[PDB]
Design an enzyme around this catalytic site. Structure first.
Site, PDB file in Angstrom:
ATOM      1  N   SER A  55     -12.620  -0.570  29.530  1.00 28.94           N
ATOM      2  CA  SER A  55     -13.885   0.113  29.901  1.00 28.94           C
ATOM      3  C   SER A  55     -14.471  -0.458  31.200  1.00 28.94           C
ATOM      4  CB  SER A  55     -14.910   0.031  28.805  1.00 28.94           C
ATOM      5  OG  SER A  55     -14.548   0.853  27.685  1.00 28.94           O
TER       6      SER A  55
ATOM      7  N   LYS B 191     -14.989   1.732  34.382  1.00 29.71           N
ATOM      8  CA  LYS B 191     -16.083   2.733  34.497  1.00 29.71           C
ATOM      9  C   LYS B 191     -17.055   2.349  35.627  1.00 29.71           C
ATOM     10  CE  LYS B 191     -15.213   4.048  29.783  1.00 29.71           C
ATOM     11  NZ  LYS B 191     -15.475   3.844  28.344  1.00 29.71           N
TER      12      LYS B 191
ATOM     13  N   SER C  76     -20.649   2.857  27.447  1.00 28.03           N
ATOM     14  CA  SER C  76     -19.170   2.874  27.507  1.00 28.03           C
ATOM     15  C   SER C  76     -18.651   4.189  26.912  1.00 28.03           C
ATOM     16  CB  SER C  76     -18.609   1.675  26.802  1.00 28.03           C
ATOM     17  OG  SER C  76     -17.393   1.293  27.395  1.00 28.03           O
TER      18      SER C  76
ATOM     19  N   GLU D 178      -9.019   8.324  29.388  1.00 31.61           N
ATOM     20  CA  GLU D 178      -9.510   7.770  28.107  1.00 31.61           C
ATOM     21  C   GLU D 178      -8.922   8.628  26.989  1.00 31.61           C
ATOM     22  OE1 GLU D 178     -10.738   5.120  27.306  1.00 31.61           O
ATOM     23  OE2 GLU D 178     -11.965   4.261  28.914  1.00 31.61           O
TER      24      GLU D 178
ATOM     25  N   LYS E 231     -20.455  -5.126  32.595  1.00 29.31           N
ATOM     26  CA  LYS E 231     -19.689  -4.056  31.928  1.00 29.31           C
ATOM     27  C   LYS E 231     -18.566  -4.702  31.132  1.00 29.31           C
ATOM     28  CE  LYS E 231     -18.493  -0.031  30.613  1.00 29.31           C
ATOM     29  NZ  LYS E 231     -18.287  -0.772  29.346  1.00 29.31           N
TER      30      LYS E 231
ATOM     31  N   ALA F 182     -12.653  -3.402  25.851  1.00 26.29           N
ATOM     32  CA  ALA F 182     -11.770  -3.784  24.735  1.00 26.29           C
ATOM     33  C   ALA F 182     -10.618  -2.785  24.734  1.00 26.29           C
ATOM     34  CB  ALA F 182     -12.535  -3.772  23.441  1.00 26.29           C
TER      35      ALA F 182
HETATM   36  C1  LIG Z   1     -13.922   0.204  26.676  1.00 23.56           C
HETATM   37  O1  LIG Z   1     -13.074  -0.605  26.891  1.00 23.56           O
HETATM   38  N1  LIG Z   1     -13.902   0.955  25.452  1.00 23.56           N
HETATM   39  C2  LIG Z   1     -14.959   1.977  25.104  1.00 23.56           C
HETATM   40  C3  LIG Z   1     -15.676   1.620  23.814  1.00 23.56           C
HETATM   41  N2  LIG Z   1     -16.601   0.465  24.028  1.00 23.56           N
HETATM   42  O2  LIG Z   1     -15.914  -0.777  23.978  1.00 23.56           O
HETATM   43  S1  LIG Z   1     -16.606  -1.708  25.162  1.00 23.56           S
HETATM   44  O3  LIG Z   1     -18.089  -1.727  25.025  1.00 23.56           O
HETATM   45  O4  LIG Z   1     -15.988  -3.060  25.195  1.00 23.56           O
HETATM   46  O5  LIG Z   1     -16.414  -0.962  26.441  1.00 23.56           O
HETATM   47  C4  LIG Z   1     -14.750   1.320  22.696  1.00 23.56           C
HETATM   48  C5  LIG Z   1     -13.509   0.583  22.989  1.00 23.56           C
HETATM   49  C6  LIG Z   1     -12.882   0.764  24.379  1.00 23.56           C
HETATM   50  C7  LIG Z   1     -11.821   1.890  24.423  1.00 23.56           C
HETATM   51  N3  LIG Z   1     -10.609   1.722  23.620  1.00 23.56           N
HETATM   52  O6  LIG Z   1     -11.907   2.853  25.127  1.00 23.56           O
END
Ligand SMILES: *C(=O)N1C[C@H](NOS(=O)(=O)O)CC[C@H]1C(N)=O
Length: 262
Positions: A44, A47, A104, A140, A208, A211
Protein backbone atom coordinates in the site's frame (compact mmCIF):
# COMPACT_ATOMS: atom_id res chain seq x y z
CA UNK A 1 24.31 2.11 17.13
CA UNK A 2 21.08 1.32 19.09
CA UNK A 3 18.61 1.71 16.12
CA UNK A 4 20.67 -0.41 13.64
CA UNK A 5 20.96 -3.09 16.45
CA UNK A 6 17.08 -3.06 16.76
CA UNK A 7 16.77 -3.65 12.96
CA UNK A 8 19.28 -6.58 13.10
CA UNK A 9 17.43 -7.98 16.21
CA UNK A 10 14.08 -7.57 14.28
CA UNK A 11 15.61 -9.65 11.38
CA UNK A 12 16.65 -12.30 14.00
CA UNK A 13 13.18 -12.33 15.66
CA UNK A 14 11.07 -12.08 12.44
CA UNK A 15 13.30 -14.65 10.62
CA UNK A 16 13.29 -12.31 7.56
CA UNK A 17 15.05 -9.40 5.80
CA UNK A 18 14.37 -5.84 7.13
CA UNK A 19 15.18 -2.75 4.99
CA UNK A 20 15.75 0.61 6.73
CA UNK A 21 16.54 4.28 5.82
CA UNK A 22 16.69 7.38 8.05
CA UNK A 23 17.03 10.33 5.59
CA UNK A 24 17.79 14.00 6.39
CA UNK A 25 14.78 15.84 4.81
CA UNK A 26 16.88 19.06 4.39
CA UNK A 27 20.09 17.66 2.71
CA UNK A 28 18.41 14.48 1.33
CA UNK A 29 21.46 12.48 2.58
CA UNK A 30 21.05 8.98 4.15
CA UNK A 31 21.85 9.23 7.93
CA UNK A 32 21.47 5.44 8.66
CA UNK A 33 20.56 2.48 6.38
CA UNK A 34 20.18 -1.34 6.35
CA UNK A 35 19.88 -3.29 3.04
CA UNK A 36 19.35 0.09 1.27
CA UNK A 37 19.85 -1.42 -2.27
CA UNK A 38 17.67 -4.55 -1.63
CA UNK A 39 14.19 -4.89 -3.20
CA UNK A 40 10.99 -5.15 -1.08
CA UNK A 41 7.30 -5.16 -2.13
CA UNK A 42 5.86 -1.60 -1.81
CA UNK A 43 2.36 -2.93 -0.96
CA UNK A 44 0.00 0.00 0.00
CA UNK A 45 3.06 2.37 0.36
CA UNK A 46 2.84 2.76 -3.49
CA UNK A 47 -0.42 4.83 -3.05
CA UNK A 48 1.70 7.91 -2.00
CA UNK A 49 3.68 7.60 -5.32
CA UNK A 50 0.32 7.15 -7.20
CA UNK A 51 -1.13 10.35 -5.65
CA UNK A 52 2.22 12.08 -6.45
CA UNK A 53 1.63 11.07 -10.13
CA UNK A 54 -2.02 12.32 -9.92
CA UNK A 55 -0.91 15.69 -8.39
CA UNK A 56 1.80 16.13 -11.12
CA UNK A 57 -1.06 15.74 -13.68
CA UNK A 58 -3.25 18.20 -11.65
CA UNK A 59 -0.34 20.78 -11.70
CA UNK A 60 -0.04 20.31 -15.56
CA UNK A 61 -3.90 20.57 -15.83
CA UNK A 62 -4.37 17.01 -17.28
CA UNK A 63 -6.31 16.22 -14.03
CA UNK A 64 -8.54 18.28 -11.66
CA UNK A 65 -8.87 17.30 -7.96
CA UNK A 66 -12.57 18.38 -8.21
CA UNK A 67 -13.27 15.97 -11.16
CA UNK A 68 -15.91 13.35 -10.17
CA UNK A 69 -15.43 9.62 -11.03
CA UNK A 70 -18.53 7.33 -11.07
CA UNK A 71 -17.85 3.55 -10.76
CA UNK A 72 -19.85 0.29 -10.32
CA UNK A 73 -20.18 -2.22 -7.40
CA UNK A 74 -18.37 -4.57 -9.90
CA UNK A 75 -15.25 -2.27 -9.79
CA UNK A 76 -15.00 -3.03 -5.97
CA UNK A 77 -11.95 -5.19 -4.97
CA UNK A 78 -11.00 -6.45 -1.45
CA UNK A 79 -10.56 -3.66 1.18
CA UNK A 80 -12.70 -0.77 -0.21
CA UNK A 81 -14.14 0.80 2.99
CA UNK A 82 -14.65 4.34 1.46
CA UNK A 83 -15.41 3.57 -2.24
CA UNK A 84 -18.10 0.93 -1.39
CA UNK A 85 -20.05 3.84 0.33
CA UNK A 86 -20.17 6.17 -2.80
CA UNK A 87 -21.74 3.93 -5.53
CA UNK A 88 -24.63 6.40 -6.32
CA UNK A 89 -22.73 9.75 -5.87
CA UNK A 90 -19.19 8.66 -7.02
CA UNK A 91 -16.04 10.42 -5.67
CA UNK A 92 -13.74 13.30 -6.73
CA UNK A 93 -10.04 12.58 -7.55
CA UNK A 94 -9.25 14.44 -4.24
CA UNK A 95 -11.66 12.07 -2.35
CA UNK A 96 -10.05 9.03 -4.10
CA UNK A 97 -6.50 10.11 -3.07
CA UNK A 98 -7.86 10.75 0.49
CA UNK A 99 -9.30 7.15 0.46
CA UNK A 100 -6.06 5.66 -1.02
CA UNK A 101 -3.66 7.20 1.57
CA UNK A 102 -5.70 7.80 4.80
CA UNK A 103 -7.72 4.51 4.61
CA UNK A 104 -5.51 2.50 2.15
CA UNK A 105 -8.70 1.96 0.02
CA UNK A 106 -7.77 -0.61 -2.73
CA UNK A 107 -10.60 0.34 -5.21
CA UNK A 108 -9.58 4.05 -4.85
CA UNK A 109 -5.98 3.00 -5.79
CA UNK A 110 -7.18 1.15 -8.97
CA UNK A 111 -9.51 4.05 -10.03
CA UNK A 112 -6.50 6.47 -9.71
CA UNK A 113 -4.15 4.09 -11.69
CA UNK A 114 -6.81 4.15 -14.48
CA UNK A 115 -6.67 8.04 -14.40
CA UNK A 116 -2.82 8.03 -15.14
CA UNK A 117 -2.82 5.06 -17.65
CA UNK A 118 -2.01 2.23 -15.15
CA UNK A 119 1.13 0.75 -13.47
CA UNK A 120 3.41 1.28 -16.58
CA UNK A 121 2.64 5.06 -16.44
CA UNK A 122 3.34 5.28 -12.65
CA UNK A 123 6.74 3.64 -13.41
CA UNK A 124 7.26 6.19 -16.29
CA UNK A 125 6.41 9.02 -13.76
CA UNK A 126 9.04 7.73 -11.22
CA UNK A 127 11.61 7.17 -14.07
CA UNK A 128 11.15 10.82 -15.26
CA UNK A 129 11.61 12.29 -11.68
CA UNK A 130 14.94 10.33 -11.45
CA UNK A 131 13.82 7.05 -9.71
CA UNK A 132 14.96 4.30 -12.19
CA UNK A 133 14.72 1.62 -9.39
CA UNK A 134 11.05 1.65 -8.16
CA UNK A 135 8.58 -0.18 -10.47
CA UNK A 136 4.82 -0.86 -10.44
CA UNK A 137 3.60 -3.71 -12.71
CA UNK A 138 0.25 -4.89 -11.26
CA UNK A 139 -3.08 -3.56 -9.88
CA UNK A 140 -4.78 -4.05 -6.46
CA UNK A 141 -4.71 -6.59 -4.99
CA UNK A 142 -2.25 -8.66 -7.13
CA UNK A 143 0.71 -6.23 -6.60
CA UNK A 144 0.86 -7.55 -2.93
CA UNK A 145 1.80 -11.18 -3.96
CA UNK A 146 5.41 -10.69 -2.66
CA UNK A 147 6.72 -13.78 -4.61
CA UNK A 148 10.30 -14.28 -3.30
CA UNK A 149 12.95 -12.60 -5.60
CA UNK A 150 10.18 -11.20 -7.90
CA UNK A 151 11.12 -7.57 -8.84
CA UNK A 152 7.47 -6.74 -9.84
CA UNK A 153 5.85 -3.97 -7.68
CA UNK A 154 9.09 -3.41 -5.66
CA UNK A 155 11.21 -0.48 -4.42
CA UNK A 156 14.46 -0.29 -2.39
CA UNK A 157 14.56 1.53 0.99
CA UNK A 158 17.01 4.08 -0.59
CA UNK A 159 14.92 4.71 -3.77
CA UNK A 160 11.64 5.03 -1.79
CA UNK A 161 13.23 7.42 0.80
CA UNK A 162 14.76 9.72 -1.93
CA UNK A 163 11.55 9.58 -4.07
CA UNK A 164 9.38 10.47 -1.00
CA UNK A 165 11.74 13.41 -0.19
CA UNK A 166 11.45 14.68 -3.86
CA UNK A 167 7.58 14.41 -3.78
CA UNK A 168 7.23 16.17 -0.36
CA UNK A 169 10.01 18.83 -0.72
CA UNK A 170 11.58 18.65 -4.26
CA UNK A 171 11.13 20.97 -7.28
CA UNK A 172 8.68 18.49 -9.01
CA UNK A 173 5.24 19.41 -7.47
CA UNK A 174 3.71 22.87 -6.80
CA UNK A 175 3.71 24.04 -3.13
CA UNK A 176 -0.12 23.38 -3.11
CA UNK A 177 0.42 19.76 -4.33
CA UNK A 178 3.31 19.10 -1.83
CA UNK A 179 1.07 20.46 1.00
CA UNK A 180 -1.93 18.30 -0.13
CA UNK A 181 0.23 15.10 -0.34
CA UNK A 182 1.84 15.55 3.12
CA UNK A 183 -1.65 16.53 4.52
CA UNK A 184 -3.15 13.21 3.26
CA UNK A 185 -0.26 11.25 4.93
CA UNK A 186 -0.62 13.30 8.19
CA UNK A 187 -4.35 12.22 8.20
CA UNK A 188 -3.43 8.44 7.94
CA UNK A 189 -5.96 6.41 10.03
CA UNK A 190 -4.63 2.81 9.40
CA UNK A 191 -1.02 3.08 10.80
CA UNK A 192 -1.90 3.42 14.56
CA UNK A 193 0.31 0.57 15.96
CA UNK A 194 3.46 1.42 13.88
CA UNK A 195 5.65 4.60 14.08
CA UNK A 196 2.69 6.60 15.58
CA UNK A 197 2.78 4.21 18.63
CA UNK A 198 6.31 5.55 19.58
CA UNK A 199 5.63 9.27 18.72
CA UNK A 200 5.86 11.69 21.70
CA UNK A 201 3.25 14.51 22.09
CA UNK A 202 4.09 17.65 19.99
CA UNK A 203 5.80 15.59 17.20
CA UNK A 204 4.61 15.76 13.56
CA UNK A 205 4.07 12.54 11.52
CA UNK A 206 2.89 11.96 7.92
CA UNK A 207 3.04 8.27 6.92
CA UNK A 208 1.73 5.45 4.74
CA UNK A 209 1.71 1.76 5.79
CA UNK A 210 1.52 -1.47 3.77
CA UNK A 211 1.03 -5.21 4.26
CA UNK A 212 1.14 -8.09 1.73
CA UNK A 213 1.57 -11.87 1.38
CA UNK A 214 4.49 -13.83 2.94
CA UNK A 215 4.75 -11.52 6.02
CA UNK A 216 5.23 -8.31 3.93
CA UNK A 217 4.88 -5.12 6.05
CA UNK A 218 6.25 -1.59 5.68
CA UNK A 219 5.92 2.11 6.40
CA UNK A 220 7.18 5.37 4.82
CA UNK A 221 7.08 8.54 6.95
CA UNK A 222 8.15 12.17 7.27
CA UNK A 223 8.43 12.97 11.03
CA UNK A 224 10.16 15.33 13.50
CA UNK A 225 9.83 17.19 16.83
CA UNK A 226 8.15 20.64 17.35
CA UNK A 227 5.34 19.87 14.83
CA UNK A 228 7.60 19.93 11.70
CA UNK A 229 9.00 16.98 9.68
CA UNK A 230 12.84 16.92 9.51
CA UNK A 231 13.55 13.25 8.61
CA UNK A 232 12.17 10.53 6.30
CA UNK A 233 12.02 6.92 7.65
CA UNK A 234 11.44 3.87 5.41
CA UNK A 235 10.99 0.36 6.95
CA UNK A 236 10.18 -2.76 4.88
CA UNK A 237 10.21 -6.48 5.74
CA UNK A 238 9.24 -9.52 3.62
CA UNK A 239 9.44 -13.31 4.16
CA UNK A 240 8.39 -13.53 7.88
CA UNK A 241 5.89 -16.18 9.19
CA UNK A 242 5.26 -13.71 12.12
CA UNK A 243 1.76 -12.42 13.04
CA UNK A 244 0.59 -8.95 11.88
CA UNK A 245 0.84 -7.98 15.62
CA UNK A 246 4.55 -9.00 16.01
CA UNK A 247 5.40 -7.27 12.67
CA UNK A 248 3.63 -4.08 13.92
CA UNK A 249 5.52 -4.26 17.30
CA UNK A 250 8.93 -4.74 15.50
CA UNK A 251 8.34 -1.56 13.36
CA UNK A 252 7.14 0.33 16.52
CA UNK A 253 10.40 -0.68 18.37
CA UNK A 254 12.61 0.53 15.44
CA UNK A 255 10.52 3.78 15.64
CA UNK A 256 11.00 4.05 19.46
CA UNK A 257 14.83 3.72 18.94
CA UNK A 258 15.25 6.35 16.13
CA UNK A 259 13.08 8.81 18.21
CA UNK A 260 15.05 7.96 21.43
CA UNK A 261 18.39 8.64 19.57
CA UNK A 262 17.12 11.62 17.44
C1 LIG B 1 -1.79 -2.11 1.66
O1 LIG B 1 -0.72 -2.64 1.65
N1 LIG B 1 -2.98 -2.89 1.80
C2 LIG B 1 -4.36 -2.28 1.84
C3 LIG B 1 -5.08 -2.62 3.14
N2 LIG B 1 -4.50 -1.85 4.28
O2 LIG B 1 -3.33 -2.46 4.78
S1 LIG B 1 -2.30 -1.21 5.14
O3 LIG B 1 -2.98 -0.19 5.99
O4 LIG B 1 -1.03 -1.72 5.71
O5 LIG B 1 -2.09 -0.47 3.86
C4 LIG B 1 -5.07 -4.07 3.45
C5 LIG B 1 -3.85 -4.84 3.15
C6 LIG B 1 -2.98 -4.38 1.96
C7 LIG B 1 -3.35 -5.08 0.63
N3 LIG B 1 -3.14 -6.53 0.54
O6 LIG B 1 -3.73 -4.50 -0.34
Amino acid sequence: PETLVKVKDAEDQLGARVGYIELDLNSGKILESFRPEERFPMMSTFKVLLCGAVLSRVDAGQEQLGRRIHYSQNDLVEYSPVTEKHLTDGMTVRELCSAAITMSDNTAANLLLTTIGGPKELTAFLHNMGDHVTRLDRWEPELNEAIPNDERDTTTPAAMATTLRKLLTGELLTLASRQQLIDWMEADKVAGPLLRSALPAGWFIADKSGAGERGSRGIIAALGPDGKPSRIVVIYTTGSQATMDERNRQIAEIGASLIKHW
